[PDB]
Amino acid sequence: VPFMVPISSDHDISSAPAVQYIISTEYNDRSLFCTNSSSPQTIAGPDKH
Amino acid sequence: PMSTRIAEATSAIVSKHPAYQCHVCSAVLFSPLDLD
Numbered sequence: 001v002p003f004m005v006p007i008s009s010d011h012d013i014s015s016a017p018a019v020q021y022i023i024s025t026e027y028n029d030r031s032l033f034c035t036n037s038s039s040p041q042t043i044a045g046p047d048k049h
Numbered sequence: 050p051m052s053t054r055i056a057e058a059t060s061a062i063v064s065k066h067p068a069y070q071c072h073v074c075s076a077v078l079f080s081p082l083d084l085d
């Protein structure tokens with residue numbers, strides 16, 4: 001199953017439309033270790049520590 | 050010339066020794082790098 005996820009960012013960014021058709025029905029992003037690991041904090045998108 | 054006058058003027062006082070797409074502004078781009 002193909003999922004289309006956004007790239008997290010450590011800084012303000014402009015937004016733009018995104019058309020999706022497939023989503024999960026329960027948490028499954030557990031393999032996610034860390035976003036913007038080398039930066040102070042994640043501003044937009046999924047933020048994981 | 051002023052310089053010439055100054056020269057001549059001091060020369061009389063002398064003495065000697067005697068003897069892609071951007072949704073912010075809508076501009077269109079072509080490189081992903083050209084975007085950033």
Ligand SMILES: [Zn+2]
Nearest residue numbers: 071073074076
């Ligand atoms: Zn722009």
